[PDB]
Design a protein around this ligand. Structure first.
Ligand SMILES: *[C@@H]1O[C@H](CO)[C@@H](O[C@@H]2O[C@H](CO)[C@@H](O)[C@H](O)[C@H]2NC(C)=O)[C@H](O)[C@H]1NC(C)=O
Ligand SMILES: *[C@@H]1O[C@H](CO)[C@@H](O)[C@H](O)[C@H]1NC(C)=O
Lengths: 42, 49
Protein backbone atom coordinates (compact mmCIF):
# COMPACT_ATOMS: atom_id res chain seq x y z
CA UNK A 1 0.00 0.00 0.00
CA UNK A 2 1.34 3.38 -1.15
CA UNK A 3 0.26 6.70 0.36
CA UNK A 4 -0.32 9.45 -2.25
CA UNK A 5 0.47 13.07 -1.23
CA UNK A 6 0.14 16.13 -3.55
CA UNK A 7 3.71 17.34 -4.06
CA UNK A 8 4.70 20.62 -2.42
CA UNK A 9 2.80 23.79 -3.34
CA UNK A 10 1.78 27.12 -1.74
CA UNK A 11 1.22 30.86 -2.03
CA UNK A 12 3.96 33.13 -3.41
CA UNK A 13 4.22 36.60 -1.92
CA UNK A 14 6.66 39.09 -3.49
CA UNK A 15 8.10 41.67 -1.07
CA UNK A 16 9.30 44.97 -2.52
CA UNK A 17 10.36 48.45 -1.55
CA UNK A 18 8.61 50.88 -3.93
CA UNK A 19 9.61 50.89 -7.63
CA UNK A 20 10.78 54.51 -7.01
CA UNK A 21 13.25 53.06 -4.39
CA UNK A 22 14.48 49.79 -6.06
CA UNK A 23 13.91 46.89 -8.50
CA UNK A 24 15.33 44.35 -5.97
CA UNK A 25 12.70 41.99 -4.40
CA UNK A 26 12.43 39.13 -1.90
CA UNK A 27 9.93 36.23 -2.24
CA UNK A 28 8.05 34.29 0.43
CA UNK A 29 6.93 30.72 -0.33
CA UNK A 30 4.06 30.62 2.16
CA UNK A 31 3.94 27.44 4.29
CA UNK A 32 6.80 25.85 2.25
CA UNK A 33 9.83 24.33 3.94
CA UNK A 34 12.48 25.43 1.38
CA UNK A 35 14.27 22.15 1.19
CA UNK A 36 11.58 21.73 -1.56
CA UNK A 37 12.19 25.08 -3.42
CA UNK A 38 15.78 23.89 -4.31
CA UNK A 39 14.19 20.52 -5.37
CA UNK A 40 12.25 22.68 -7.91
CA UNK A 41 15.57 24.24 -9.30
CA UNK A 42 8.72 29.76 -14.04
CA UNK B 1 -10.28 39.92 18.40
CA UNK B 2 -9.44 37.92 15.26
CA UNK B 3 -10.02 34.65 13.39
CA UNK B 4 -7.72 32.32 11.38
CA UNK B 5 -6.38 33.84 8.13
CA UNK B 6 -7.62 31.51 5.37
CA UNK B 7 -6.04 31.82 1.94
CA UNK B 8 -7.55 29.66 -0.85
CA UNK B 9 -5.99 28.85 -4.22
CA UNK B 10 -9.24 29.09 -6.23
CA UNK B 11 -7.68 27.12 -9.15
CA UNK B 12 -6.25 24.33 -6.93
CA UNK B 13 -9.64 24.03 -5.18
CA UNK B 14 -11.79 23.96 -8.36
CA UNK B 15 -9.39 22.26 -10.83
CA UNK B 16 -6.53 20.79 -8.67
CA UNK B 17 -3.53 20.24 -11.06
CA UNK B 18 -5.74 19.75 -14.21
CA UNK B 19 -4.80 22.26 -16.94
CA UNK B 20 -7.81 21.35 -19.17
CA UNK B 21 -10.01 22.28 -16.20
CA UNK B 22 -7.95 25.49 -15.73
CA UNK B 23 -8.57 26.61 -19.36
CA UNK B 24 -12.33 26.15 -18.75
CA UNK B 25 -12.08 28.09 -15.46
CA UNK B 26 -10.50 31.09 -17.30
CA UNK B 27 -13.76 31.35 -19.33
CA UNK B 28 -15.51 32.46 -16.07
CA UNK B 29 -13.52 35.74 -15.93
CA UNK B 30 -12.32 37.45 -12.75
CA UNK B 31 -14.22 35.31 -10.15
CA UNK B 32 -11.07 33.63 -8.77
CA UNK B 33 -9.33 37.05 -8.48
CA UNK B 34 -12.45 38.35 -6.65
CA UNK B 35 -12.47 35.34 -4.27
CA UNK B 36 -8.74 35.76 -3.48
CA UNK B 37 -9.00 39.54 -3.15
CA UNK B 38 -11.89 39.12 -0.69
CA UNK B 39 -10.02 36.52 1.44
CA UNK B 40 -6.79 38.63 1.34
CA UNK B 41 -8.86 41.62 2.56
CA UNK B 42 -10.14 39.56 5.53
CA UNK B 43 -6.62 38.19 6.22
CA UNK B 44 -4.98 41.68 6.40
CA UNK B 45 -7.83 42.87 8.64
CA UNK B 46 -7.07 40.17 11.29
CA UNK B 47 -3.73 41.91 11.93
CA UNK B 48 -5.43 45.35 11.95
CA UNK B 49 -7.94 44.14 14.58
C1 LIG C 1 12.44 21.51 7.09
O1 LIG C 1 12.58 20.09 6.74
C2 LIG C 1 13.76 19.42 7.33
C3 LIG C 1 13.75 17.95 6.92
O2 LIG C 1 14.08 17.84 5.52
C4 LIG C 1 13.70 19.59 8.85
O3 LIG C 1 14.91 18.97 9.42
C5 LIG C 1 14.63 18.05 10.52
O4 LIG C 1 14.36 18.82 11.74
C6 LIG C 1 14.08 18.02 12.96
C7 LIG C 1 13.90 18.99 14.13
O5 LIG C 1 15.10 19.76 14.33
C8 LIG C 1 15.21 16.99 13.18
O6 LIG C 1 14.79 16.07 14.21
C9 LIG C 1 15.51 16.17 11.92
O7 LIG C 1 16.62 15.28 12.18
C10 LIG C 1 15.83 17.11 10.75
N1 LIG C 1 16.12 16.33 9.54
C11 LIG C 1 17.11 16.65 8.71
C12 LIG C 1 17.20 15.80 7.43
O8 LIG C 1 17.90 17.55 8.95
C13 LIG C 1 13.66 21.07 9.24
O9 LIG C 1 13.65 21.20 10.69
C14 LIG C 1 12.40 21.69 8.62
N2 LIG C 1 12.27 23.10 8.98
C15 LIG C 1 11.37 23.53 9.86
C16 LIG C 1 11.32 25.04 10.12
O10 LIG C 1 10.60 22.76 10.44
C1 LIG D 1 10.35 59.38 -6.14
O1 LIG D 1 10.65 59.84 -4.79
C2 LIG D 1 11.31 61.18 -4.78
C3 LIG D 1 11.63 61.58 -3.33
O2 LIG D 1 12.56 60.64 -2.75
C4 LIG D 1 10.37 62.20 -5.46
O3 LIG D 1 11.07 63.45 -5.62
C5 LIG D 1 9.92 61.75 -6.86
O4 LIG D 1 8.96 62.73 -7.36
C6 LIG D 1 9.32 60.33 -6.81
N1 LIG D 1 8.99 59.84 -8.15
C7 LIG D 1 7.86 60.14 -8.79
C8 LIG D 1 7.64 59.44 -10.13
O5 LIG D 1 7.07 60.96 -8.33
Amino acid sequence: ILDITPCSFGGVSVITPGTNTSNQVAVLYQGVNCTEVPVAIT
Amino acid sequence: VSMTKTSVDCTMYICGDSTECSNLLLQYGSFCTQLNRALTGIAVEQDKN
